[PDB]
């Protein structure tokens, strides 16, 4: 049975013709090739230098899910049935209150909205809409809670967001042991595969302190990976030399694609290095085709 | 903004960066930098209290107000002592405190994050020194084939707010390479620990990429200049 | 343009000759290693299709006559990274009957029902029993494919390569005719870093398996600049152990094929 | 003197060296050398019984006389079982024995000497091989700095009477450095593990320095030429 | 260039081998670091330091200007070592007519293992060693230098000992109850040919690094890196330590220099280039 | 405390006027510089190869002491005396039966030996004793101290043959603490009764890690290094001395640490200057 086809936030893919959902950023979906994340998969957005661009993506995911549930609650003059419930594995309780608000400034619609960083989403999400799971509890207990929460919401779209995976201030050294982290990721992958008709997964990690073995293990475990690299000194200085006349035409760094969705699962080599750029604007975060000046 | 101004501001501790790291080798120690720090703090007139932690120090410094011999005394009571000597949990009109630790090489890796979280507070800032040449012990107990936890240096470099690297400047006829070999085989040459040394400064910007610079510092004239 | 070619493994021009099954007490191993960007779905599918239908019709564009097969011939597939449905969906595009292949699930509920509150010996014995029960009922013609077993080393703590070989791999190989190992060689390909001694318990398994093998297949991307005309390059080379056959003249032929993947189609050609 | 005669004599088990060590890698295994050994021994009436110990292989060789699966039983049972298949301290001069170990990379280091202190006998010749790439297991010995025991390879080389090293002869258009860097990336080229290969032989004597000789062996025609 | 004339020994700015200012104050502990190889034992260094502290001035190597004592006749020295015995020090000192009441010797070699190490834990043995040392200092008041030679051997004696443990319970507690301390150690571990022991035996080198860091002056004796004739024995280098001098005179400083010494039968010289 | 004043085996050193004892080979006593090894000291001899040459040196060392003991004829109450008791720290008790016999200013201080001959009569338990190296260090130290205390004024000769052999020493003793403590205790004992006890030992370095090597080298008083030649050197020497079958040197001798000369602050290194040869009647060392 899965998710009811009356749901608004899910659209069949062009190629696979399978259920797909957007991430809240149109450029991110466009890069993925499916213009969305097909249900039953995952994605990893690793980061270089201490910079913290990924929190924007995590908040965009959570806000898109919350907004879908909110329009479902509204259901203006019809029965839209855009139900969505979001589960976040973290301990930053303020995260729920940091979701950006909608953008109200000056084909298939209602799929992906437009968000504003400066604004704030209101009212605050209710407890039934959003739950948090402590990342310090034992692996078995966490898996049990995730399974129960999945079971309780029988007919709701589920997004599992793991913000800032493997942060030293966020996890004890015991959790850094290979067995614990790898087993947790394996269990999460199993749970995603089981209810493949309703659940999607998103996560991010900073690779500055991660040993290469754990990095390759995580890359193998997930379904897709995107690498973000900020620019260097001479790059930024030379760009500002000839682009400071237009202060709205300077990016922040490059985007690298290593593992794609099912495209690469069947045996396609699609690794593109240094051919895309990302720019974080005052209200929006965009991705465009990189071009060397 | 001229980098000299930023260096003077951070040296005066007018900035609100909570954690500061200093890395040194045997070619150039660090206590001169602490002398510069306290001289700058007194010059500004903001005589913040200073707390010293004793690990590899026997002679009590002049400027320090509280002395803590943590060598013979365990970690939990050490944290209790630091907390007790620290100001209140919350006081809007409380004077800022200064915490100096001689060496960070005596704390096990599985405690650094907890210790840093517990000692941290908006009232006080901590400066610390880590010895690059000293290598910790990893054969005391061996967990599963690899524990995957990062080393000490990488951990502090990740969790710090400003990175200070101290290097020696050679005035003789010896190249850097031969100096390094002599130090490695422990045949100490002449012309080390001079009063004029080189500094590498790294500041973590609030939003995104950090900024790094190089400088030449003399401890007699207290005149910091920028090397191109 | 280039000329289409046909896959070949051994001197008798047969990819998976059937006499391996008629001979009694002669166990053999295959080692398929690949990188993370060259996923071997087509290789496994073509191998199963050759075993059951008697020819790799997917790749050789039906350029050869059919070889007798499909008489009760069976296959067993287990994996630690894809559970049950991925194999079923991949297979149900070549009309393979559902009564000839059996898929074991080692992805769903594995950690909860296997690892927590169980010692390592119990884990290995139970997995071996699960494999044995499946292999028992089809003893005549059954190749056993297993993909990424070394992942176990991560889930179990205190588990060593020698222990894994002693308690899991060798007993399984002793009760099988053709055992095929699918592995990922990401470990050896970390740029500007060495893991020779920094991570050795993982490479030990790969080296030991290659030693105990008789034929090796390598899936790699292009070392030179990118060429959209081809995906990677498949190398077929001699293994490390003699073939447990009776035809003394049967020898493996080493070669390479430039292979390009498309919308569910692989093109093979030298260059 | 002709080293070929010495090589033929040592291969034919004419000597009295009670331990033979082979060195291998993933480029060239060492079972071909074992086949050469048994062929030479059989071709000159030295049809000694052969005892095989299994750690890796599961297909029993035809020439093998006793097959024991050591992958399961522990040390004391294994050594007792091996001893029960040997003469007991009063070996008759009727015939010799030849115990073969498929791989030594699996016995804990500390027991090696004790193992060699038991199975050794005047009527035996332990022929064993060591994989140069398979690094030892650190779970056995405590990694503390107090432990100053030498590594497995050096201990075995010091305690062995004759050392045999196997190397692969290159034929294609590649070089040794290219082959090594390809192997480190696990991109196996073609032409490796062929039938013609180099050799290194070290013989040690109780009256002078050991000696080294390098041969080229063709496993098909049984030709041993001098490099 | 090529001065065969022997030169006197000078360490600090005031042209004195060992000033007395390190004694007429409280809380002014200091540490000398002497490093030698197995080729060049620093016997004459120890003898010269002891005679300078007790008699009043170096004589074996200097011009013998014949100055008076820096302090009272009570001026005392304490010598202990984990590598040598009592008679060694006694015979070495009696060659210079050193009074028997002006020095004391602690024996850390005779029956050490059979009566100290066996059937005892680490804390107990470290405490006993510290108590035995502290007894000598509590015997007599200040102007009592303490010399300990090769203390790092405990790392190879006690099972599972660490540099951090040794410094935090033996070296620093003893330095806190002393005025001037001297650490004499062998640095052959750094000169093993073509073998970077820093990555393997890092625990040993950690002790040397930490001791040098806490030092205020370093004296190193080394054989000539480039081989020459029998006209010289070795080279002595004087370098500033890694810690400031605990002194009130802000004008004081340590002079950095190098000398070459040649040693013949029970007598060594000291000259410039 | 003390020994016989007119002991036939003890003579004052030339360069130090100290009691001295010969090691069995006059060449070693010459290379030492003190006309023998002075009492209260020790010597360590290495060999960087798989062969064995130090064994005959230890055999000579024990044989000289047993011969000095052997001057006890039934015409006893001689003015001379050579009271000597030998302690060997090993397990191969057959070594005692392999001691070479006699070949045929101060007199009888040093004897010449022949390797081929044996020593009839064989030594008895009351003179040569054995201690098993497979016991806890405390037990070994207790046994050695008991033996030393029991003998009143007999000159004790202590020799350790084939130190650190894997087939001879269990891996447990390979821990740094155990072996280093054993050497430290033996040094303490030999420095306690410095007027009588002498210590000798030999080792092979091809299986010893450099750290343990430098520690053991530091623990001893004098180190001698033996290095045989390679194939090319052997062939060149054979070609040169084709007509001289007595001038083929097996290897070099390296001097790194000496007796008291070194400990008082002298330079005594000499690399590639002396060549040795295992002659049928003498371990002959000469200029290279």
PDB file of N, CA, C and O in Angstrom, chain F residues 147-193:
ATOM      1  N   UNK F 147      76.012 -19.069  46.387  1.00  0.00           N
ATOM      2  CA  UNK F 147      77.267 -19.676  45.956  1.00  0.00           C
ATOM      3  C   UNK F 147      78.452 -18.794  46.315  1.00  0.00           C
ATOM      4  O   UNK F 147      79.484 -19.280  46.793  1.00  0.00           O
ATOM      5  N   UNK F 148      78.322 -17.486  46.093  1.00  0.00           N
ATOM      6  CA  UNK F 148      79.423 -16.578  46.393  1.00  0.00           C
ATOM      7  C   UNK F 148      79.713 -16.563  47.887  1.00  0.00           C
ATOM      8  O   UNK F 148      80.875 -16.608  48.312  1.00  0.00           O
ATOM      9  N   UNK F 149      78.666 -16.507  48.710  1.00  0.00           N
ATOM     10  CA  UNK F 149      78.862 -16.463  50.154  1.00  0.00           C
ATOM     11  C   UNK F 149      79.486 -17.753  50.667  1.00  0.00           C
ATOM     12  O   UNK F 149      80.315 -17.727  51.584  1.00  0.00           O
ATOM     13  N   UNK F 150      79.094 -18.893  50.095  1.00  0.00           N
ATOM     14  CA  UNK F 150      79.579 -20.176  50.592  1.00  0.00           C
ATOM     15  C   UNK F 150      81.089 -20.302  50.424  1.00  0.00           C
ATOM     16  O   UNK F 150      81.788 -20.760  51.333  1.00  0.00           O
ATOM     17  N   UNK F 151      81.610 -19.897  49.270  1.00  0.00           N
ATOM     18  CA  UNK F 151      83.049 -19.921  49.050  1.00  0.00           C
ATOM     19  C   UNK F 151      83.695 -18.742  49.766  1.00  0.00           C
ATOM     20  O   UNK F 151      83.216 -17.608  49.665  1.00  0.00           O
ATOM     21  N   UNK F 152      84.782 -19.007  50.491  1.00  0.00           N
ATOM     22  CA  UNK F 152      85.380 -17.973  51.329  1.00  0.00           C
ATOM     23  C   UNK F 152      86.232 -17.016  50.504  1.00  0.00           C
ATOM     24  O   UNK F 152      85.928 -15.823  50.400  1.00  0.00           O
ATOM     25  N   UNK F 153      87.306 -17.527  49.899  1.00  0.00           N
ATOM     26  CA  UNK F 153      88.247 -16.671  49.189  1.00  0.00           C
ATOM     27  C   UNK F 153      88.595 -17.207  47.808  1.00  0.00           C
ATOM     28  O   UNK F 153      89.533 -16.695  47.184  1.00  0.00           O
ATOM     29  N   UNK F 154      87.888 -18.220  47.318  1.00  0.00           N
ATOM     30  CA  UNK F 154      88.148 -18.723  45.978  1.00  0.00           C
ATOM     31  C   UNK F 154      87.787 -17.669  44.941  1.00  0.00           C
ATOM     32  O   UNK F 154      86.747 -17.013  45.035  1.00  0.00           O
ATOM     33  N   UNK F 155      88.656 -17.506  43.949  1.00  0.00           N
ATOM     34  CA  UNK F 155      88.384 -16.588  42.849  1.00  0.00           C
ATOM     35  C   UNK F 155      87.241 -17.149  42.016  1.00  0.00           C
ATOM     36  O   UNK F 155      87.325 -18.273  41.512  1.00  0.00           O
ATOM     37  N   UNK F 156      86.174 -16.386  41.872  1.00  0.00           N
ATOM     38  CA  UNK F 156      85.010 -16.841  41.122  1.00  0.00           C
ATOM     39  C   UNK F 156      85.089 -16.311  39.701  1.00  0.00           C
ATOM     40  O   UNK F 156      85.326 -15.120  39.477  1.00  0.00           O
ATOM     41  N   UNK F 157      84.896 -17.202  38.734  1.00  0.00           N
ATOM     42  CA  UNK F 157      84.792 -16.831  37.330  1.00  0.00           C
ATOM     43  C   UNK F 157      83.366 -17.098  36.879  1.00  0.00           C
ATOM     44  O   UNK F 157      82.868 -18.221  37.017  1.00  0.00           O
ATOM     45  N   UNK F 158      82.706 -16.070  36.354  1.00  0.00           N
ATOM     46  CA  UNK F 158      81.327 -16.166  35.891  1.00  0.00           C
ATOM     47  C   UNK F 158      81.314 -15.891  34.397  1.00  0.00           C
ATOM     48  O   UNK F 158      81.800 -14.846  33.947  1.00  0.00           O
ATOM     49  N   UNK F 159      80.763 -16.823  33.629  1.00  0.00           N
ATOM     50  CA  UNK F 159      80.690 -16.702  32.181  1.00  0.00           C
ATOM     51  C   UNK F 159      79.281 -17.055  31.728  1.00  0.00           C
ATOM     52  O   UNK F 159      78.716 -18.067  32.156  1.00  0.00           O
ATOM     53  N   UNK F 160      78.712 -16.210  30.881  1.00  0.00           N
ATOM     54  CA  UNK F 160      77.382 -16.411  30.325  1.00  0.00           C
ATOM     55  C   UNK F 160      77.531 -16.707  28.838  1.00  0.00           C
ATOM     56  O   UNK F 160      77.871 -15.826  28.049  1.00  0.00           O
ATOM     57  N   UNK F 161      77.311 -17.951  28.422  1.00  0.00           N
ATOM     58  CA  UNK F 161      77.457 -18.295  27.006  1.00  0.00           C
ATOM     59  C   UNK F 161      76.147 -18.183  26.242  1.00  0.00           C
ATOM     60  O   UNK F 161      75.077 -18.550  26.731  1.00  0.00           O
ATOM     61  N   UNK F 162      76.251 -17.669  25.020  1.00  0.00           N
ATOM     62  CA  UNK F 162      75.126 -17.573  24.093  1.00  0.00           C
ATOM     63  C   UNK F 162      73.935 -16.869  24.741  1.00  0.00           C
ATOM     64  O   UNK F 162      72.866 -17.446  24.942  1.00  0.00           O
ATOM     65  N   UNK F 163      74.147 -15.605  25.085  1.00  0.00           N
ATOM     66  CA  UNK F 163      73.085 -14.816  25.689  1.00  0.00           C
ATOM     67  C   UNK F 163      71.978 -14.550  24.677  1.00  0.00           C
ATOM     68  O   UNK F 163      72.241 -14.305  23.497  1.00  0.00           O
ATOM     69  N   UNK F 164      70.733 -14.612  25.150  1.00  0.00           N
ATOM     70  CA  UNK F 164      69.550 -14.304  24.348  1.00  0.00           C
ATOM     71  C   UNK F 164      69.463 -15.195  23.106  1.00  0.00           C
ATOM     72  O   UNK F 164      69.552 -14.736  21.967  1.00  0.00           O
ATOM     73  N   UNK F 165      69.292 -16.489  23.348  1.00  0.00           N
ATOM     74  CA  UNK F 165      69.013 -17.410  22.262  1.00  0.00           C
ATOM     75  C   UNK F 165      67.576 -17.890  22.351  1.00  0.00           C
ATOM     76  O   UNK F 165      67.161 -18.393  23.404  1.00  0.00           O
ATOM     77  N   UNK F 166      66.790 -17.737  21.282  1.00  0.00           N
ATOM     78  CA  UNK F 166      65.353 -18.050  21.383  1.00  0.00           C
ATOM     79  C   UNK F 166      65.071 -19.480  21.802  1.00  0.00           C
ATOM     80  O   UNK F 166      64.149 -19.721  22.592  1.00  0.00           O
ATOM     81  N   UNK F 167      65.847 -20.443  21.302  1.00  0.00           N
ATOM     82  CA  UNK F 167      65.651 -21.828  21.709  1.00  0.00           C
ATOM     83  C   UNK F 167      66.138 -22.073  23.126  1.00  0.00           C
ATOM     84  O   UNK F 167      65.825 -23.114  23.711  1.00  0.00           O
ATOM     85  N   UNK F 168      66.892 -21.133  23.687  1.00  0.00           N
ATOM     86  CA  UNK F 168      67.462 -21.264  25.016  1.00  0.00           C
ATOM     87  C   UNK F 168      66.739 -20.441  26.066  1.00  0.00           C
ATOM     88  O   UNK F 168      66.685 -20.854  27.225  1.00  0.00           O
ATOM     89  N   UNK F 169      66.176 -19.297  25.687  1.00  0.00           N
ATOM     90  CA  UNK F 169      65.485 -18.420  26.613  1.00  0.00           C
ATOM     91  C   UNK F 169      64.019 -18.316  26.239  1.00  0.00           C
ATOM     92  O   UNK F 169      63.701 -18.068  25.068  1.00  0.00           O
ATOM     93  N   UNK F 170      63.107 -18.502  27.186  1.00  0.00           N
ATOM     94  CA  UNK F 170      61.681 -18.377  26.885  1.00  0.00           C
ATOM     95  C   UNK F 170      61.329 -16.951  26.509  1.00  0.00           C
ATOM     96  O   UNK F 170      62.014 -16.003  26.922  1.00  0.00           O
ATOM     97  N   UNK F 171      60.275 -16.756  25.713  1.00  0.00           N
ATOM     98  CA  UNK F 171      59.896 -15.394  25.311  1.00  0.00           C
ATOM     99  C   UNK F 171      59.565 -14.481  26.473  1.00  0.00           C
ATOM    100  O   UNK F 171      59.730 -13.262  26.346  1.00  0.00           O
ATOM    101  N   UNK F 172      59.107 -15.026  27.603  1.00  0.00           N
ATOM    102  CA  UNK F 172      58.767 -14.184  28.743  1.00  0.00           C
ATOM    103  C   UNK F 172      59.976 -13.393  29.221  1.00  0.00           C
ATOM    104  O   UNK F 172      59.862 -12.206  29.546  1.00  0.00           O
ATOM    105  N   UNK F 173      61.146 -14.031  29.262  1.00  0.00           N
ATOM    106  CA  UNK F 173      62.351 -13.334  29.696  1.00  0.00           C
ATOM    107  C   UNK F 173      62.768 -12.257  28.706  1.00  0.00           C
ATOM    108  O   UNK F 173      63.594 -11.400  29.039  1.00  0.00           O
ATOM    109  N   UNK F 174      62.219 -12.276  27.491  1.00  0.00           N
ATOM    110  CA  UNK F 174      62.568 -11.255  26.513  1.00  0.00           C
ATOM    111  C   UNK F 174      61.984  -9.890  26.846  1.00  0.00           C
ATOM    112  O   UNK F 174      62.331  -8.911  26.178  1.00  0.00           O
ATOM    113  N   UNK F 175      61.100  -9.806  27.836  1.00  0.00           N
ATOM    114  CA  UNK F 175      60.646  -8.511  28.320  1.00  0.00           C
ATOM    115  C   UNK F 175      61.835  -7.704  28.815  1.00  0.00           C
ATOM    116  O   UNK F 175      62.737  -8.244  29.458  1.00  0.00           O
ATOM    117  N   UNK F 176      61.832  -6.405  28.514  1.00  0.00           N
ATOM    118  CA  UNK F 176      62.973  -5.565  28.859  1.00  0.00           C
ATOM    119  C   UNK F 176      63.244  -5.583  30.355  1.00  0.00           C
ATOM    120  O   UNK F 176      64.403  -5.637  30.786  1.00  0.00           O
ATOM    121  N   UNK F 177      62.182  -5.561  31.163  1.00  0.00           N
ATOM    122  CA  UNK F 177      62.351  -5.475  32.608  1.00  0.00           C
ATOM    123  C   UNK F 177      63.138  -6.663  33.143  1.00  0.00           C
ATOM    124  O   UNK F 177      64.083  -6.490  33.916  1.00  0.00           O
ATOM    125  N   UNK F 178      62.781  -7.877  32.724  1.00  0.00           N
ATOM    126  CA  UNK F 178      63.396  -9.071  33.295  1.00  0.00           C
ATOM    127  C   UNK F 178      64.885  -9.145  32.977  1.00  0.00           C
ATOM    128  O   UNK F 178      65.721  -9.298  33.876  1.00  0.00           O
ATOM    129  N   UNK F 179      65.239  -9.032  31.696  1.00  0.00           N
ATOM    130  CA  UNK F 179      66.639  -9.169  31.308  1.00  0.00           C
ATOM    131  C   UNK F 179      67.464  -8.013  31.858  1.00  0.00           C
ATOM    132  O   UNK F 179      68.590  -8.208  32.339  1.00  0.00           O
ATOM    133  N   UNK F 180      66.926  -6.793  31.798  1.00  0.00           N
ATOM    134  CA  UNK F 180      67.676  -5.648  32.296  1.00  0.00           C
ATOM    135  C   UNK F 180      67.874  -5.755  33.800  1.00  0.00           C
ATOM    136  O   UNK F 180      68.948  -5.430  34.318  1.00  0.00           O
ATOM    137  N   UNK F 181      66.859  -6.225  34.527  1.00  0.00           N
ATOM    138  CA  UNK F 181      67.022  -6.432  35.954  1.00  0.00           C
ATOM    139  C   UNK F 181      68.034  -7.512  36.268  1.00  0.00           C
ATOM    140  O   UNK F 181      68.794  -7.401  37.232  1.00  0.00           O
ATOM    141  N   UNK F 182      68.065  -8.571  35.459  1.00  0.00           N
ATOM    142  CA  UNK F 182      69.065  -9.613  35.662  1.00  0.00           C
ATOM    143  C   UNK F 182      70.473  -9.060  35.482  1.00  0.00           C
ATOM    144  O   UNK F 182      71.361  -9.304  36.309  1.00  0.00           O
ATOM    145  N   UNK F 183      70.692  -8.299  34.408  1.00  0.00           N
ATOM    146  CA  UNK F 183      72.008  -7.705  34.190  1.00  0.00           C
ATOM    147  C   UNK F 183      72.363  -6.720  35.294  1.00  0.00           C
ATOM    148  O   UNK F 183      73.512  -6.671  35.743  1.00  0.00           O
ATOM    149  N   UNK F 184      71.391  -5.925  35.740  1.00  0.00           N
ATOM    150  CA  UNK F 184      71.640  -4.976  36.818  1.00  0.00           C
ATOM    151  C   UNK F 184      72.032  -5.691  38.103  1.00  0.00           C
ATOM    152  O   UNK F 184      72.975  -5.277  38.787  1.00  0.00           O
ATOM    153  N   UNK F 185      71.334  -6.775  38.442  1.00  0.00           N
ATOM    154  CA  UNK F 185      71.681  -7.519  39.640  1.00  0.00           C
ATOM    155  C   UNK F 185      73.046  -8.168  39.546  1.00  0.00           C
ATOM    156  O   UNK F 185      73.814  -8.167  40.512  1.00  0.00           O
ATOM    157  N   UNK F 186      73.368  -8.733  38.382  1.00  0.00           N
ATOM    158  CA  UNK F 186      74.678  -9.347  38.206  1.00  0.00           C
ATOM    159  C   UNK F 186      75.778  -8.296  38.309  1.00  0.00           C
ATOM    160  O   UNK F 186      76.831  -8.539  38.911  1.00  0.00           O
ATOM    161  N   UNK F 187      75.556  -7.116  37.728  1.00  0.00           N
ATOM    162  CA  UNK F 187      76.527  -6.037  37.858  1.00  0.00           C
ATOM    163  C   UNK F 187      76.687  -5.621  39.312  1.00  0.00           C
ATOM    164  O   UNK F 187      77.807  -5.387  39.780  1.00  0.00           O
ATOM    165  N   UNK F 188      75.578  -5.531  40.045  1.00  0.00           N
ATOM    166  CA  UNK F 188      75.653  -5.166  41.454  1.00  0.00           C
ATOM    167  C   UNK F 188      76.472  -6.184  42.232  1.00  0.00           C
ATOM    168  O   UNK F 188      77.301  -5.822  43.074  1.00  0.00           O
ATOM    169  N   UNK F 189      76.250  -7.470  41.961  1.00  0.00           N
ATOM    170  CA  UNK F 189      77.004  -8.509  42.655  1.00  0.00           C
ATOM    171  C   UNK F 189      78.485  -8.455  42.304  1.00  0.00           C
ATOM    172  O   UNK F 189      79.342  -8.571  43.187  1.00  0.00           O
ATOM    173  N   UNK F 190      78.812  -8.272  41.022  1.00  0.00           N
ATOM    174  CA  UNK F 190      80.216  -8.277  40.620  1.00  0.00           C
ATOM    175  C   UNK F 190      80.921  -7.027  41.128  1.00  0.00           C
ATOM    176  O   UNK F 190      82.146  -7.012  41.289  1.00  0.00           O
ATOM    177  N   UNK F 191      80.167  -5.957  41.381  1.00  0.00           N
ATOM    178  CA  UNK F 191      80.769  -4.775  41.981  1.00  0.00           C
ATOM    179  C   UNK F 191      80.815  -4.866  43.498  1.00  0.00           C
ATOM    180  O   UNK F 191      81.588  -4.138  44.128  1.00  0.00           O
ATOM    181  N   UNK F 192      80.007  -5.741  44.096  1.00  0.00           N
ATOM    182  CA  UNK F 192      80.055  -5.930  45.541  1.00  0.00           C
ATOM    183  C   UNK F 192      81.352  -6.610  45.954  1.00  0.00           C
ATOM    184  O   UNK F 192      82.153  -6.047  46.706  1.00  0.00           O
ATOM    185  N   UNK F 193      81.578  -7.825  45.465  1.00  0.00           N
ATOM    186  CA  UNK F 193      82.835  -8.535  45.692  1.00  0.00           C
ATOM    187  C   UNK F 193      83.830  -8.241  44.578  1.00  0.00           C
ATOM    188  O   UNK F 193      84.320  -9.140  43.898  1.00  0.00           O
TER     189      UNK F 193
END
